[PDB]
Amino acid sequence: MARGPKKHLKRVAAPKHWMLDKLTSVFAPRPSTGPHKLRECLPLIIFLRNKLKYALTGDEVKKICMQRFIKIDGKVRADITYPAGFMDVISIDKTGENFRLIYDTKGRFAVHRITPEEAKYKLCKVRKIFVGTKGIPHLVTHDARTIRYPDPLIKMNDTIQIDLETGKITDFIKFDTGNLCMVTGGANLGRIGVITNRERHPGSFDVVHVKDANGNSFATRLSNIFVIGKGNKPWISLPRGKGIRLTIAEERDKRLAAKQSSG
């Protein structure tokens, strides 16, 4: 300990949702410092060699990266343990694949190919909205991108379509009763749904009652709610499953029925 920043991760003390095995070694990658908090991220190495199967070694993951093969949000990233995350793009070119890091209904970064457009833009949730220096205002998104001069409607918890080459917000969505939502943490991590209610507490802690396209209702902390568009009208790709969440029995019913017969 106690004099400085930790540089190692004991594997096992890594986040479950990477789904690294128990045996293999002692240490997991441990996310570099970056645009996404370490728990809530997906080090490229895990993406290249743990989800996509392009790499075997970590030696290979590096060999891939140094080529420049891979861009995150458009701008070649060359670090093994780069902390990619929710709403990130990731583009492997000489292979033609665009993927958006967005959740399972398990709560696992999903392998989700997106079109060669779309790859252009990402939706960021506003975290803070700011009068910076010289009297300029700025918004700050989840992914740690600061955009100056935003339009005055935009308020904390709203979301915001960023261009991506250029930065540049190219509109927005208000947080209001009835907006489509993505759940980014906690028990309900991955469930998508409309809203219904925000219960408000002074001092601390606002809950958001969500209802899914199945009249399934649930709550989380406001911190955990991300706005992604208008009911039935997401502003991004959703992964197969539309973040639905099915009981372990329903889940069994689908698994045996779709196959050992049903094509």
Binding site: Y54, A55, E60
Partner: protein, 126 residues
């Protein structure tokens, strides 16, 4: 007794210049098969040639007559020679290289540390 080399789970992996797949080798009833026989035999299914089809892993199963492994076949012999683990290239008659075995070298370096800069001095001393 004929064999049969079967390549399961294929991936075309451009960003490392090679097609990577499992190798499933039936040998019905004896055991086995040479790594060299396997690379020769594969070389002719993927239209590639031996020296681009590295092969590794491998464990004959339980009781006899099968062996599952893993193979790679590289699009440029250059691309292999560079994407390549070095120990892999060494294994067949194209790569070999220097040993030590390691503590002789560490000892050399620690001897060198004593001596102010120069150090080349320490090289002539080792």
């Amino acid at each position: 007794d004929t064999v049969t080399i079967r390549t399961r789970k294929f991936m075309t992996n451009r960003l490392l210049q090679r097609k990577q797949m499992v190798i499933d080798v039936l040998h019905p009833g004896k055991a086995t098969v040479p790594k060299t026989e396997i690379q020769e035999k594969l070389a002719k299914m993927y239209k590639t040639t031996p020296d681009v089809i590295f092969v590794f892993g491998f464990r004959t199963h339980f009781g006899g007559g099968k062996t599952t492994g893993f193979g790679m076949i590289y699009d440029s012999l250059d691309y292999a020679k560079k994407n390549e683990p070095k120990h892999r290239l060494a294994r067949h008659g194209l790569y070999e290289k220097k040993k030590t075995s390691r503590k002789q070298r560490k000892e050399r370096k620690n001897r060198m540390k004593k001596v102010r800069g120069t150090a080349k001095a320490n090289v002539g001393a080792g």
